[PDB]
Ligand binder design. Structure first.
Ligand SMILES: CCCNC(=O)[C@H]1O[C@@H](n2cnc3c(N)ncnc32)[C@H](O)[C@@H]1O
Length: 225
């Protein structure tokens, strides 16, 4: 277990994003789904050049799960996943060149009254908007080139640890949101299914929500797109 501070610019970026989307919190789920989609594209593109790419997990899905009792929301993809060093660098620092650009266009647009939600989506920085609804964000990731690890943060710092549960994802990433008290509605299946549907019509991968039929109850993955 290693402890880390966020880079200064990521602290600023977190605040810009939270402020930009404060009255549209639900866009957090849009961005998590987009990130999962990009991750599935990446492994799909890798499988064109590497016969083993999918060996760790033969599926390509996004699977969402509400856990009312533990107050958790889980967004799981079987995409490319992240190595330990990518968990640290990609989430904890300004890692790409596009991210800096985003910082400039965001502040210029935000002073000029121009729309910013598109900026967040364009540059793929929406991960941080999970903090509008969660007190704790947890990222479990398994990448073909590393062992499974857990990233966790309350936004005031983050830590990364080897997952003691070993390789349970096979390949891919689970974003786990410890929801704020004011965000318990994101644990309701009807809420989540409408949002998931709303945000997944463009995803070139199937997206499922763990749902109940129903005194007899049957739970199963329900395709959303
Ligand atoms: C740039 C703003 C924060 N950085 C990310 O979201 C990056 O983290 C990684 N990331 C986030 N969610 C991911 C996922 N589900 N699978 C793989 N990488 C992911 C991607 O490299 C994103 O560019």
């Amino acid at each position: 277990s290693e402890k880390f501070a966020f880079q200064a610019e990521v602290n600023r970026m977190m605040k810009l994003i939270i402020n930009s989307l404060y009255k549209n919190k639900e866009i957090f789920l849009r961005e998590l789904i987009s990130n999962a989609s990009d991750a599935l594209d990446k492994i799909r593109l890798i499988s064109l050049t590497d016969e083993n790419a999918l060996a760790g997990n033969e599926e390509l899905t996004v699977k969402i799960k509400c856990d009312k009792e533990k107050n958790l929301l889980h967004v799981t993809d079987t995409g490319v996943g992240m190595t330990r060093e990518e968990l640290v660098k990609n989430l904890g620092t300004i890692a790409k060149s596009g991210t800096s650009e985003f910082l400039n266009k965001m502040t210029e647009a935000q002073e000029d009254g121009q729309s910013t939600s598109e900026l967040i989506g364009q540059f793929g920085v929406g991960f941080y908007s999970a903090f509008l609804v969660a007190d704790k964000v947890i990222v479990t990731s398994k990448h073909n080139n590393d062992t499974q690890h857990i990233w966790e943060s309350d936004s005031n710092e983050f830590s990364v640890i080897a997952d003691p549960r070993g390789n349970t994802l096979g390949r891919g990433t689970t974003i786990t949101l410890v929801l704020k008290e004011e965000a318990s509605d994101y644990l309701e299946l009807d809420t989540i299914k409408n949002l998931v549907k709303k945000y997944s019509q463009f995803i070139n991968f199937p997206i499922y929500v763990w749902s109940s039929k129903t005194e007899k109850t049957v739970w199963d993955w329900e395709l959303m797109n």
